[PDB]
Structure 1
Amino acid sequence: QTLHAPHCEVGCAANVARRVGVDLARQVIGAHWASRMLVREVGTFPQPLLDRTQVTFSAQGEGWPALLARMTGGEVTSRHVPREELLSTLHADRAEGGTLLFMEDRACPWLDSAHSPGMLPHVVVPDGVAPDGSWQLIEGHSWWRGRYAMSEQDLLAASYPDPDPHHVAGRVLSLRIRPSAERAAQLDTLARQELAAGLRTYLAAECGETETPAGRIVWANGPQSVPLLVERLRGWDYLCPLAARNDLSTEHARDVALGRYLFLALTDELAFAAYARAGTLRLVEGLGLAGAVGGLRPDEAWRLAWRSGQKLYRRLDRQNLSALFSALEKAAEVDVEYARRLLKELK
């Protein structure tokens, strides 16, 4: 019943977007066609926050907060809120949209974590107060999708933990995104326009480079992104003979766990790509353009690449690594052929 997505903050926004008549997966995320490889690597000394070279993929583009805001006409703002206002803010944003409330993994019992606050904070959506008097929270992640009840005393201790490693004390992402009367009638028109703009940015294939204290950040867009991602990922093939050793030292197991974590982050981004391309596809079908474009299935290609990364994460072989590369190259070729076909039909 509740919407979900590979990224918890994305599925959370999908539930809030349904409150106000917006189809996030089809009209917002499906309207932003993007493909981007990113690298964090050594740049100019000093860069103290650069712990390791890191490469990942992203099909999010500008991201849903940028597109959801300018499409509906509203705002998506981050804010730290004092402890007394939180309940008032949660009740208030329910009118013009909703709230994404940040939480350590330790505070969500259904996540089972309990003994660790996670690497990154979690996100849930307050969904009113039950007749019981406790709060209803929606979990946006696909694995733990559904509604969960929390007492007000527990909700307030969760939003203000001590200690606070993730700095989430009273953190709130307010979604004032209820479109006006005319805006709701213009939704598919703007989705058609955003679909064309994203495909143009995709085929422009711009590059970029910035120097930060966390390292040099390189990114490449468009059809070249996934082939460039595959070529860079070949450098981590040393993990396969390493992981095959049960005769491992402590420091060596750190490199294995770090390399495995890099492929877990990649696997989640491949799952989002499949989720996004399926929304792009439901939008093309809704615009009455599926017949003109053809029967290409970029969402299924990204789904197979997602399965390959899952299989590589569970067991780091050279064959599983090579199987991920083939699934990624196939997904890249279907992507650029579908993008070129779809842009021509949109004129």
Structure 2
Amino acid sequence: QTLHAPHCEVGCAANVARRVGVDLARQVIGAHWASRMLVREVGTFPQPLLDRTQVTFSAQGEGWPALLARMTGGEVTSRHVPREELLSTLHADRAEGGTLLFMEDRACPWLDSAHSPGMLPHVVVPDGVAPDGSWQLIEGHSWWRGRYAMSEQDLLAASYPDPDPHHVAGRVLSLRIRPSAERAAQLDTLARQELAAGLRTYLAAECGETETPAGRIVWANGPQSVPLLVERLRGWDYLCPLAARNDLSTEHARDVALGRYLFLALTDELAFAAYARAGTLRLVEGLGLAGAVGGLRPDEAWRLAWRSGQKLYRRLDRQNLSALFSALEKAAEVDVEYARRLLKEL
């Protein structure tokens, strides 16, 4: 069965990681405990790519590409490749891992997105050639998890589109991640070391700020990240009375739709947090530390906040806004007690 994740690129990496005997969810993502509030907002003029104040959450920390590489000793590097050389690079990558292949949503018929290339590009994992000569594409997104066959012709049609709004033209992420059999024996040892290192970064609770052409990017780590996030998201309660009207302007229905999109993107991050925290718990139990840390369930607290984000996205009103904030405050407080307990035991 095909592995999946709330972020489809992580699902893809998980399938690839399994080929080389690496458990991404448990040993890589689960080994990296993180909690960060991120804000894009007005800073120093000019910032022409700053289209709106924007807030979200991330439990990805450094991210799986940096951690998958670190821990396997291998390599997760991105690159554009010319159409003549694409079919071969796929077979070449599969030997030592695999490829994340970027295409538009309209290039994947199962996505049902013919009339639009999507807000962001999509990603699939090519899994070798079937008897027919048609390629096997692994879909990493939980909503469409599985295997889809696509003719070879369509694969270069999909990977080199015209026009190319997403600059997706033959873009590939190359996972060269096969651990040497000595490194492979060190995986749980290294996972336990990454586990402690992320917990220390979490409790260090550092703050940061950068000025970019897309705006000022603010971030805050650690136990205060979710209380700071909730405080900031209150600023969007104006969406509730606006969305309860049926006679919205064109300009006003745009406000609502971007605010709603802000809450969809956050909901996917809460799903990811629940997925990561489960991986951490499986890593903890496999390390034999579960009985020492206790029965706290940060993965469950984040799942409830995910569901509550879904509920807000479907019906953007004040009761569901307030219920999201309260589910997030609960996840913040189970997180910090679990983090402190787990670092103590390590």
TM-score normalised to structure 2 length: 1.00
Whole-angstrom distance in 1 between the partners of 2:246 and 2:290: 51
**Structure 2: segments with no counterpart, 5+ residues:** none
Whole-angstrom distance in 2 between the partners of 1:308 and 1:194: 31
Shift of 1:259: 0.1
Shift of 1:132: 1.0
Whole-angstrom distance in 2 between the partners of 1:129 and 1:115: 29
Secondary structure at 1:77's aligned position in 2? strand
Deviations 1:48-102 (A, max 9, x none): 0000000000000000000000100000010100001000000100000000000
Shift of 1:198: 0.1
Shift of 1:155: 0.5
Whole-angstrom distance in 1 between the partners of 2:322 and 2:228: 15
Whole-angstrom distance in 2 between the partners of 1:187 and 1:282: 14
Whole-angstrom distance in 1 between the partners of 2:113 and 2:242: 28
Deviations 1:240-291 (A, max 9, x none): 0000001100000000000000000000000000000000000000000000
- In structure 2, the residue matched to 1:219 is 219
Q: Write out the 4+ residue segments of structure 1 that deviate beyond 6 Å after TM superposition.
A: none
Shift of 1:181: 1.1
Shift of 1:125: 0.3
Shift of 1:109: 0.4
Whole-angstrom distance in 1 between the partners of 2:245 and 2:111: 31
Shift of 1:165: 0.1
Secondary structure at 2:278's aligned position in 1? helix
Whole-angstrom distance in 2 between the partners of 1:162 and 1:181: 44
Shift of 1:4: 0.2
Deviations 1:286-321 (A, max 9, x none): 000000000000000000000000000000010000
Whole-angstrom distance in 2 between the partners of 1:48 and 1:156: 34
Deviations 1:96-143 (A, max 9, x none): 000000000010000001100000000000000000110000000000
Task: Tell me the matched-pair count.
Answer: 346
Secondary structure at 1:334's aligned position in 2? helix
Whole-angstrom distance in 2 between the partners of 1:331 and 1:24: 23
**Structure 1: segments with no counterpart, 5+ residues:** none
Whole-angstrom distance in 1 between the partners of 2:36 and 2:333: 15
Whole-angstrom distance in 2 between the partners of 1:278 and 1:41: 32
Secondary structure at 2:223's aligned position in 1? helix
Deviations 1:5-27 (A, max 9, x none): 00000000000000000000000
Secondary structure at 2:123's aligned position in 1? strand
Whole-angstrom distance in 2 between the partners of 1:94 and 1:47: 41
User: Which residues of 2 match residues 258-337 of structure 1 at below 5 A?
Assistant: 258-337=258-337
Shift of 1:211: 0.2
Whole-angstrom distance in 2 between the partners of 1:70 and 1:326: 37
Whole-angstrom distance in 1 between the partners of 2:44 and 2:239: 28
Secondary structure at 1:98's aligned position in 2? strand
Deviations 1:148-183 (A, max 9, x none): 000000000000000000001010000000000100
TM-score normalised to structure 1 length: 1.00
**% identical equivalent positions:** 100
Whole-angstrom distance in 2 between the partners of 1:292 and 1:203: 20
- In structure 1, the residue matched to 2:197 is 197
Deviations 1:300-343 (A, max 9, x none): 00000000000000000100000000000000000000000000
Whole-angstrom distance in 2 between the partners of 1:213 and 1:156: 33
Shift of 1:187: 0.2
Whole-angstrom distance in 1 between the partners of 2:18 and 2:181: 16
- Name the Cα RMSD after superposition: 0.3
Secondary structure at 2:120's aligned position in 1? coil
User: Which residues of 2 match residues 335-346 of structure 1 at below 5 A?
Assistant: 335-346=335-346
Whole-angstrom distance in 1 between the partners of 2:158 and 2:14: 23
Secondary structure at 1:141's aligned position in 2? coil
Secondary structure at 2:84's aligned position in 1? coil
Whole-angstrom distance in 2 between the partners of 1:304 and 1:47: 37
